[PDB]
Amino acid sequence: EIVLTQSPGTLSLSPGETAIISCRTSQYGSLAWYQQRPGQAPRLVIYSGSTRAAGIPDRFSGSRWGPDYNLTISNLESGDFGVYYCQQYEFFGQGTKVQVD
Amino acid sequence: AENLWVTVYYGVPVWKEAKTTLFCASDARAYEKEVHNVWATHACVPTDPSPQELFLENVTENFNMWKNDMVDQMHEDIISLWDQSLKPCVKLTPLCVTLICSNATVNNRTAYDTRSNVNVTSINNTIMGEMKNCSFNTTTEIRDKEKKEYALFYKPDIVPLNETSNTSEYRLINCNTSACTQACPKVTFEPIPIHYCAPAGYAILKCNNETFNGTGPCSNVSTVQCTHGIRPVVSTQLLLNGSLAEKEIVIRSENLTNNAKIIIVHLNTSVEIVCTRPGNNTRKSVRIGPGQTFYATGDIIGDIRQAHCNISEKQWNETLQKVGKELQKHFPNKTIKYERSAGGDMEIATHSFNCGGEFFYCNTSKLFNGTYNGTDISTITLQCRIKQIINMWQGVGRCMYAPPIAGNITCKSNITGLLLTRDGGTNSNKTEETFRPAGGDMRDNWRSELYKYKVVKIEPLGVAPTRCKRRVVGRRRRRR
Amino acid sequence: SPQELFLENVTENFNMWKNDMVDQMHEDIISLWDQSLKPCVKLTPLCVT
Amino acid sequence: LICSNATVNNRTAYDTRSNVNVTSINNTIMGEMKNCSFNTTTEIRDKEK
Amino acid sequence: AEKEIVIRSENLTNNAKIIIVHLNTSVEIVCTRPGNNTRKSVRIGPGQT
Amino acid sequence: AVGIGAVFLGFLGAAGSTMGAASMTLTVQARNLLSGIVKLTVWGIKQLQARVLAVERYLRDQQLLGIWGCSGKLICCTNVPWNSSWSNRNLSEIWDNMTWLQWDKEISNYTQIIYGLLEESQNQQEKNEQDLLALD
Amino acid sequence: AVGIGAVFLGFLGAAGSTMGAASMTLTVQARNLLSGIVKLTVWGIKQLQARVLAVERYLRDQQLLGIWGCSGKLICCTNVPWNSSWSNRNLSEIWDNMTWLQWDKEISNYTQIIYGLLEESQNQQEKNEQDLLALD
Amino acid sequence: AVGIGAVFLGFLGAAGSTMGAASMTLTVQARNLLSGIVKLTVWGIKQLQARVLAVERYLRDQQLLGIWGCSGKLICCTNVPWNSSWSNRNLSEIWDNMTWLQWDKEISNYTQIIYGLLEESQNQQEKNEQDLLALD
Ligand SMILES: *[C@@H]1O[C@H](CO)[C@@H](O[C@@H]2O[C@H](CO)[C@@H](O[C@@H]3O[C@H](CO[C@H]4O[C@H](CO)[C@@H](O)[C@H](O)[C@@H]4O)[C@@H](O)[C@H](O[C@H]4O[C@H](CO)[C@@H](O)[C@H](O)[C@@H]4O)[C@@H]3O)[C@H](O)[C@H]2NC(C)=O)[C@H](O)[C@H]1NC(C)=O
Ligand SMILES: *[C@@H]1O[C@H](CO)[C@@H](O[C@@H]2O[C@H](CO)[C@@H](O[C@@H]3O[C@H](CO)[C@@H](O)[C@H](O)[C@@H]3O)[C@H](O)[C@H]2NC(C)=O)[C@H](O)[C@H]1NC(C)=O
Ligand SMILES: *[C@@H]1O[C@H](CO)[C@@H](O[C@@H]2O[C@H](CO)[C@@H](O[C@@H]3O[C@H](CO)[C@@H](O)[C@H](O)[C@@H]3O)[C@H](O)[C@H]2NC(C)=O)[C@H](O)[C@H]1NC(C)=O
Ligand SMILES: *[C@@H]1O[C@H](CO)[C@@H](O[C@@H]2O[C@H](CO)[C@@H](O[C@@H]3O[C@H](CO)[C@@H](O)[C@H](O)[C@@H]3O)[C@H](O)[C@H]2NC(C)=O)[C@H](O)[C@H]1NC(C)=O
Ligand SMILES: *[C@@H]1O[C@H](CO)[C@@H](O[C@@H]2O[C@H](CO)[C@@H](O[C@@H]3O[C@H](CO)[C@@H](O)[C@H](O)[C@@H]3O)[C@H](O)[C@H]2NC(C)=O)[C@H](O)[C@H]1NC(C)=O
Ligand SMILES: *[C@@H]1O[C@H](CO)[C@@H](O[C@@H]2O[C@H](CO)[C@@H](O)[C@H](O)[C@H]2NC(C)=O)[C@H](O)[C@H]1NC(C)=O
Ligand SMILES: *[C@@H]1O[C@H](CO)[C@@H](O[C@@H]2O[C@H](CO)[C@@H](O)[C@H](O)[C@H]2NC(C)=O)[C@H](O)[C@H]1NC(C)=O
Ligand SMILES: *[C@@H]1O[C@H](CO)[C@@H](O)[C@H](O)[C@H]1NC(C)=O
Ligand SMILES: *[C@@H]1O[C@H](CO)[C@@H](O)[C@H](O)[C@H]1NC(C)=O
Ligand SMILES: *[C@@H]1O[C@H](CO)[C@@H](O)[C@H](O)[C@H]1NC(C)=O
């Protein structure tokens, strides 16, 4: 079924501000987030819900109970912008684009 | 504290979930500790395996089949057994001489499947036709004279086209990577049942509430000193000579939604399978070195064109139907659609097993070609192939050469469980119904038997408050 | 040093043929010769005509 | 083993500001190290290279 | 050694006996083999390299 | 917390019952803790390792009992009072409700103090007995 | 059936004599039961096997003595009465005629009853003493 | 020659002090004497040899204590009088000057008699107690 769905797809944010992205999972399972650096290979950021990936600062965090997960990125620097993907065992979300003003 | 004193207790019934090495207990008895190996005569202990089960009043315990380390213990013990048993035997290194090969010839034999004599191998295409007749120079014992021996090899055992595409010159496939060792004749060994007994100070618990999915609590717990007889059989795409569940068909995965995780299906009624290699193989014996002998198949006499396995149609059909019904319960409101094997190496793209020291490989496309909760709406024959050169386990570096067995060979077996995986990405409305057979590590085979058990160490010392002060006074205390 | 001791009134049945110590000697001797001769030279290259 | 002096395909020397010219003067690693070629058996025991 | 340099022999007058000297401050040594060696791999036998 | 014992249960069959009912089987668990079960191959090492580990487990347990003055008995009354730290435990559930498998969880995190107290009390009693005998 | 013990015989030198005299050599048999005797080769396995079996046998014997309330003594009086089923044995021949090597053949076929009776009586006495201490 | 023991020292930290200020690590010394420390290779033989030798040492010591009636205690008063041949030793320095490491040298060349004396006295006491119980 439609196991993943992200929103908002498009976002505009000035540096130093806090970002917000939401992914809804329609079935029980793990959840995670990715960071596609533009024109580069994406990389893991958060996995197993709230646990951060290796080497990622505490700017990156999130949480859920059941279907709805909120991702928040406090003090988004210029280099941290890009496109973020939600993933669950095989699926990918439609992605959410954040650009720097 | 004028009414309150400690008291030491010993022999108290408490235990914790540690891990330890276990004793190997044999069938009691089929061993001969140096004369010949049947499974572990050099190594394992021939002692009485009587389980002597005990039921417990109100115990509730948590089990987990996936984390059961006894399957790892089985894996290590099996690899050590095979490695130490194959070490003294012959080396095949002198046999890697350049081989010149040609199509085989038949001296007017008959064919089973047609009422006429054999005329040509290309049409009489089984055993003969897939076998190459190879002759090669070999060193005699005295190291200064050589002679033209000959032997027949299965086509998978030889490799052209690295000898250039127009030479008709062949090597043994192993020489590209490693040197093989022949299995000793007297060492030949078969799936004898084996029992595991805990060492002193450890107790092997068992769960009798068979319907549990493989995790979580269990209430019908029991204690056993030595497990029942597990047969160390190894096969792919199908468990055979296994146990059976007292309920109807049982299915166990750590997460069914996690598609990459294998799905083990455990049957309640066995489906009989018969496999046979007709035709009388003649064991040729050719000399190597001073005192080493190599065995190879000479000419095959008798009728030739068969290497088959047979399964009852309706029995297997209804078994697959009940599997489909259970998987439909687990996956609600969608059909079930079995399919051909996904692919991969020959050892997992085909059903694999051994009978009488000969390794069989069988195309299973006839068997899983199903539809909604069963087959689409008499015996099913599986075409098969045979290899002599064997990689020991899946992809481990230990190679082998299996000596041929003379005369027609036939074996029977009881199919008891299936090994399946699921289709991946979606395409939701047309994907969930697909399942396929898949290969499996030996851990997957042994878990279907050792899901039952758990190992715990006794903690025979405990403390509690009682009514005594040593040599001095009594106590006032409470009750329920 | 054997340090023999004599017993007052003991009577015991001996059997030389069933004495398993000869089997123990047999196994020990074969193991000794086999394990001692294992590291030594092989004569296989010398089998020339 | 049949051996001969080594050859250098236009490398450079640390210790002086010039390209390598001859091993006898460029005498370290090169010069103390011999280039040897030898017949060896392949895996099939009937071909050599 | 925590004290300054230390010297040890069972008899210094016994000249043949080795004299071990133990320092208090280490002296750094750097050793290097420049040049990129290229590991050639040649086959021997069935499965030996 | 105590009961008239027996040995005919063979092994760990209770379990489950409360401590005042599970304290009967001390003889059988004491017995089975050590007794039993009993070309070049190495599992002799495995068997010897298992036997030696079992023997050292038994010897450590017996030594700990011996230091506290309890060697030679399964039940053992001692002098160490229940500490000033607890004065709280749920004895109505001790006598007839909790099994040993449950009670073992409620004494964890604190067992380390008990052995020290037992050792100190036993050594004090030993020297006191010598002081008594030295006066006659 | 009993005698003033001795250790100067070195080893099993008696034997032979009646139980009332052969019961004096307990110390030396107890001592010698465990003490002593003490390129790639495997007889280290043999030595370790022998040592481990000897130690295990000694530990089993000591445990059986401990369950019956006899650990710490060679002689040990107990409470179990002479069996209801026996009431017939040849005690005039026990005291001064039969040696232990002969008497051991007569107590066979019945020892397994004694190894249960002793522990039953010991556990009864243990709980009785615990109750008596709890009485105050 | 005696005092109130302790266990927090961990290991052999005294040593050095006189016997009356050194016979107090008995608990910890008894503990550490046996406890701990815990492709084809043979050092399993070495480990098993070390473990078995340590276990046999402990068992021999415990057996020697058991024969003398001292098993179950670290301190143990006994009945054997001071030897007729000695009657001389420097007890003023036994109590508060000599450490154990020094005193152990002065009892050498005479220890072998003491074990026999203890054994004989204990066996005499054993048979005497058995006779006393059999009197009535
Ligand atoms: C799954 O379970 C089935 C049983 O349900 C097993 O079937 C057995 O398979 C083994 C081989 O794996 C068979 O063993 C062979 O049997 C031959 C026939 O035995 C009969 O005939 C002989 C006389 O010819 C009689 O003496 C005998 O009592 C039987 O009546 C034997 O001739 C074979 O002998 C060879 O092997 C032995 C053992 O190594 C050697 O000592 C011999 O010298 C000789 O080399 C062999 O014993 C067995 O017969 C099968 N039993 C049945 C009932 O079918 C499956 O093996 C098992 N596993 C799998 C994967 O299916
Ligand atoms: C497995 O199943 C297959 C197919 O059901 C069996 O094949 C049958 O084998 C027998 C001989 O074992 C054949 O018998 C011969 O039939 C011809 C007529 O076709 C007759 O003229 C001969 O005299 C002889 O009787 C039979 O034809 C053949 N069936 C088919 C459909 O080919 C097989 O025997 C089963 N068992 C094994 C071990 O393979
Ligand atoms: C098991 O046996 C079956 C039947 O013998 C095998 O099926 C055959 O597999 C080959 C190779 O995948 C198929 O070849 C393909 O044929 C099509 C034309 O149909 C062609 O366009 C392709 O380029 C390719 O050549 C073949 O069609 C197929 N036949 C049938 C009837 O299924 C199967 O491969 C065997 N599997 C194993 C694991 O042995
Ligand atoms: C799930 O599938 C089964 C069939 O696979 C449906 O039940 C009925 O099952 C019986 C027994 O297998 C079928 O009779 C048999 O058919 C086979 C051919 O597949 C034939 O070889 C046997 O001799 C026997 O005649 C029966 O046809 C089948 N019924 C139908 C309508 O196909 C079951 O209905 C399926 N589940 C659901 C929810 O429909
Ligand atoms: C060890 O000590 C020796 C001697 O102090 C060091 O030798 C020096 O190595 C450097 C390169 O690593 C040489 O640099 C070159 O110098 C020439 C001028 O002579 C210049 O034209 C080049 O562009 C380059 O800079 C340096 O000449 C050489 N010194 C001497 C006296 O030969 C050596 O580097 C030290 N380290 C090691 C690991 O050997
Ligand atoms: C396999 O090849 C060998 C060697 O060519 C065959 O053995 C020879 O067969 C011929 C007749 O075809 C005889 O004259 C020879 O005496 C045989 N032996 C030798 C050493 O040459 C053998 O018959 C072939 N087998 C098959 C099944 O084709
Ligand atoms: C070491 O000797 C070998 C063999 O002579 C050299 O390899 C050959 O070099 C020639 C040119 O000098 C090439 O044409 C060949 O193709 C090379 N290979 C063979 C198999 O002949 C190698 O260059 C020498 N190396 C040095 C450092 O002198
Ligand atoms: C087999 O029989 C046919 C017909 O009788 C004959 O032509 C042929 O030579 C015989 N032998 C072989 C090897 O085909
Ligand atoms: C697979 O099953 C379908 C059912 O419609 C049948 O038409 C087809 O012939 C079968 N193929 C094989 C190879 O069994
Ligand atoms: C190295 O360079 C010199 C000068 O450019 C040239 O003469 C020579 O052929 C080159 N090669 C060798 C192997 O010296």
Author numbering:
A (entry chain H): 1 to 30, 33 to 91, 96 to 107
B (entry chain E): 31 to 144, 144b, 144c, 144d, 144e, 144f, 144g, 144h, ...
C (entry chain I): 80 to 128
D (entry chain A): 129 to 144, 144b, 144c, 144d, 144e, 144f, 144g, 144h, ...
E (entry chain A): 266 to 309, 312 to 316
F (entry chain F), G (entry chain J), H (entry chain B): 512 to 549, 567 to 664
Give verbatim lines from the article:
The HIV-1 Env is a trimer of gp120-gp41 heterodimers that are heavily shielded from the host immune systems by N-linked glycosylation and further protected from neutralization by conformational masking and considerable sequence variability. A glycosylated region near the base of the third variable loop (V3) of HIV-1 Env forms a supersite of vulnerability that is targeted by antibodies originating from diverse germline genes in multiple HIV-1 infected individuals. Here, we determine structures of antibodies in complex with HIV-1 Envelope for all observed members and ancestral states of the broadly neutralizing HIV-1 V3-glycan targeting DH270 antibody clonal B cell lineage. Here we used cryo-EM to visualize the interactions of a complete inferred DH270 clonal tree with the co-evolving virus Env.
Based on these two early intermediate resistance features, we selected Envs from days 358 and 526, having both G300 and long hypervariable V1 loops of 18 and 28 amino acids, respectively, and Envs from days 836 and 949, having both N300 and short hypervariable V1 loops of 11 amino acids, to identify structural hurdles to DH270 antibody interaction. Despite poor sequence similarity, examination of the V1 loop regions of each unliganded Env structure demonstrated a structurally conserved hydrophobic core and variable hydrogen bonding and/or salt bridge formation that ensures coupling of the V1 loop to the V3 GDIR/K motif. The d526 Env contained a similar hydrophobic core and displayed more order despite its longer length. This was due to direct V1 loop interaction with the nearby N332-glycan. Visual inspection of the V3 GDIR/K motif in the G300-containing d358 and d526 Env maps suggested greater disorder in the broken sheet structure compared to that of the N300-containing d836 and d949 Env maps.
